[PDB]
Amino acid sequence: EFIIRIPPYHYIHVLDQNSNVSRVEVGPKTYIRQDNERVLFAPMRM
Amino acid sequence: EFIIRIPPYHYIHVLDQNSNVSRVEVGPKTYIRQDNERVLFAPMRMVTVPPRHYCTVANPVSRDAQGLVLFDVTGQVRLRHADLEIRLAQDPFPLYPGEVLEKDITPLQVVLPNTALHLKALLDFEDKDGDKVVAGDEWLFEGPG
Amino acid sequence: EFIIRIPPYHYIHVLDQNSNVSRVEVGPKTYIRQDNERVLFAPMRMVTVPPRHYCTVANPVSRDAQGLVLFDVTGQVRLRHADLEIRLAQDPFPLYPGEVLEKDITPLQVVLPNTALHLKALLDFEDKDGDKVVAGDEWLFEGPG
Amino acid sequence: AVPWTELLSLQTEDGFWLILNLNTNGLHSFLKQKGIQSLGVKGRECLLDLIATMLVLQFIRTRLEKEGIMKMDIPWAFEAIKQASEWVRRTEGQYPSICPRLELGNDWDSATKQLLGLQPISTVSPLHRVLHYSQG
Amino acid sequence: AVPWTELLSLQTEDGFWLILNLNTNGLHSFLKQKGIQSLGVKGRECLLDLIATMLVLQFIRTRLEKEGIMKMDIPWAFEAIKQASEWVRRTEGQYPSICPRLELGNDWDSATKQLLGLQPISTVSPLHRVLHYSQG
Amino acid sequence: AVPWTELLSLQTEDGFWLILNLNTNGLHSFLKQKGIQSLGVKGRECLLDLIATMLVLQFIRTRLEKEGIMKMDIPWAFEAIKQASEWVRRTEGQYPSICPRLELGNDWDSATKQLLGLQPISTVSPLHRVLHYSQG
């Protein structure tokens, strides 16, 4: 669950549950979330 | 689970799972943790020590010239490893994480008149008289005190 | 498996399978490995040594004039093979890979008064007095120290 | 109805002293912890003989007070009580205040009666591991 | 009810000393590890005889204190106790402080009572492999 | 309960020394490997008789210490022990430090007790093929 691999030209939304604030991460990057954070859905294409 | 009510003169330890760093919260306060954080145990009393008594705590707090608790760059507390510090009568201090209460509240011993104590120096130190007390030395502490 | 949480004053060893090279990570930090990498074992405590105590570790760390850990060109740590180094009271150092903790935390021995130690030189060395102590020599270490 | 002739069998050849019903090994451990080795081996044995003699005297005096009756001096043991009093009133003067400094009591009445186990002892005193260690 | 006549059989021809119930081989290993060969063979045997004699004296004194009763000097063994005291009070002066330097105790009471096994020993002392090695 | 009269049968005609329970052939191989032929045949036999006599003395002394009791000088063997002590205290002076140089121990206590097999020997010493070669 914790490991998030964003393919090139894809994005996700992850929820900061200490702030109730969501945000996007883009790019051909790998992502690691926190305990508080929660990725909303699977990596969809930009 | 999320609601934490610290009674007056009590403390807990809570673990920052984004840093693997634990910390104390004291006082008559109410506490709310995060999703990442996890309180380790139920609120236990800040240990108090009466007059004519003492205790020793393993791994004491590293402090400055004024007695402020020194911290790490990573939010951790600064200890002195495998040492023991003897604490006299004072306010109900808390126990910072990574510390064990080895000696309990034990009384200061009274030496009766016409009776003395045989004391050995375990480690080389300097006494308040002014002599470099080498380890292995022997002492004669007598008196009614 | 991928998430690695190193507690404060703990370490692990992880294997770079693209280089067959292992390495230590210390500190109160969190760790994420790669696909190639593999953590060897669960996070164990950096071994601490109190005062009036010592330990010996097989295959010690090769160091520079300042005590920095020397490394190999291939990312490996520089050892000194089949040697033993005796470490006195210090901070909780880690054990770099390829090292065995042979002697545990054992106390510095005290010599009672009117009693001495019979010491043999196993290997030719030079003592702090200034004599070339050839192997096979015998010693008389007496004292209350 | 304690064995009395067996008490007459345990009279020593100089005049001092399981029938006594007391934890002797815990008492030796207590007196060793209080530091009785700083008197010599002769002084240690001379003090243990005094403590044992006064303990037997307090036991017999509690027995006689339950019947109703340095002043101990029945026809069957008048000689042993007499030589015990003549021993004690000579050997006590070498050790003044040895009952507080070994932490047994104020005087010999307090010390031997609190070690005899017929009176309760307060909680602030360290005399708890001599009467309750034998109850295991 | 220890065998007493068999204790009278083990009186030596000079006046010193399985019935004692003590690990003797582990005790020899402990005293060898503490370095008793640096006294000569004569000095080693003279010290072992002193340690064994004082161990038997502490055993008999614990037996007599459980009954209630350098000052050891019953009619059936007064001569053996007398010659043992006359031996010990002469041979102890050659070895002052031999109980701390061999790491058995402060004085002979502490050393012989902690080797006798009737009192518990603290954990920082190396006296654990003499009373617990025989429990296998 | 070792055979004692059979030990009295093995007293030699000058006063020196399977009942001993020791690997004798492996001991001869060990002492030959340590180079005992460089002393003459007379010196070799004089050293083997000393080693065997001290081994029997350490065996009997371990037997007497388990019962509790150059100073060895029971009525049934006082003459043999006396002449053995008078032999040993004369013949030991010819061979100083023969126990380290043959690699058996520091002194005669260490050497005869580690060869007797009642104490464990450290692993860095070459004394392993004398107590474990007989266990096959």
Swiss-Prot record, chains B, C:
- In terms of superkingdom, the source organism counts as Eukaryota
Record's comment on post-translational modification:
Phosphorylated on Tyr residues after EGF stimulation.
**Tissue expression, per UniProt?**
Present in most normal tissues. Higher expression observed in epithelial cells with secretory and excretory functions, as well as in cells chronically exposed to xenobiotics, such as bronchial cells and cells lining the intestine. Overexpressed in many multidrug-resistant cancer cells.
Report each MVP repeat as a residue range: 1-52, 53-107, 108-145
Subcellular locations according to the entry: Cytoplasm; Nucleus, Nuclear pore complex; Cytoplasm, Perinuclear region
Could you tell me what induces this protein?
Answer: Up-regulated by IFNG/IFN-gamma.
* Domains (record comment): MVP 3 mediates interaction with PTEN.
Q: How does it assemble?
A: The vault ribonucleoprotein particle is a huge (400 A x 670 A) cage structure of 12.9 MDa. It consists of a dimer of half-vaults, with each half-vault comprising 39 identical major vault protein (MVP) chains, PARP4 and one or more vault RNAs (vRNAs). Interacts with TEP1. Interacts with PTEN and activated MAPK1. The phosphorylated protein interacts with the SH2 domains of PTPN11 and SRC. Interacts with APEX1. May interact with ZNF540.
Known role: Required for normal vault structure. Vaults are multi-subunit structures that may act as scaffolds for proteins involved in signal transduction. Vaults may also play a role in nucleo-cytoplasmic transport. Down-regulates IFNG-mediated STAT1 signaling and subsequent activation of JAK. Down-regulates SRC activity and signaling through MAP kinases.
Name the record gives this protein = Major vault protein
Q: What organism is this sequence from? A: Homo sapiens
User: Which gene codes for it?
Assistant: MVP
Covered residues of the complete protein?
5 to 149 of 893
UniProtKB/Swiss-Prot annotation, chains D, E, F:
Query: Which tissues show it?
Result: Widely expressed; the highest levels are in the kidney; also detected in heart, placenta, lung, liver, skeletal muscle, spleen, leukocytes and pancreas.
For the region Interaction with the major vault protein, give the residue spans: 1-136
Q: Which domain of life is it from?
A: Eukaryota
UniProt-annotated location(s):
Cytoplasm; Nucleus; Cytoplasm, Cytoskeleton, Spindle
| Assembly, per entry | Component of the vault ribonucleoprotein particle, at least composed of MVP, PARP4 and one or more vault RNAs (vRNAs). Interacts with TEP1.
Relate the protein's function as given in its record.
Answer: Mono-ADP-ribosyltransferase that mediates mono-ADP-ribosylation of target proteins.
- Return the similarity comment: Belongs to the ARTD/PARP family.
Protein name, per record: Protein mono-ADP-ribosyltransferase PARP4
Species this protein is from = Homo sapiens (Human)
Q: Taxonomic lineage per UniProt?
A: Eukaryota, Metazoa, Chordata, Craniata, Vertebrata
Gene of origin?
Answer: PARP4
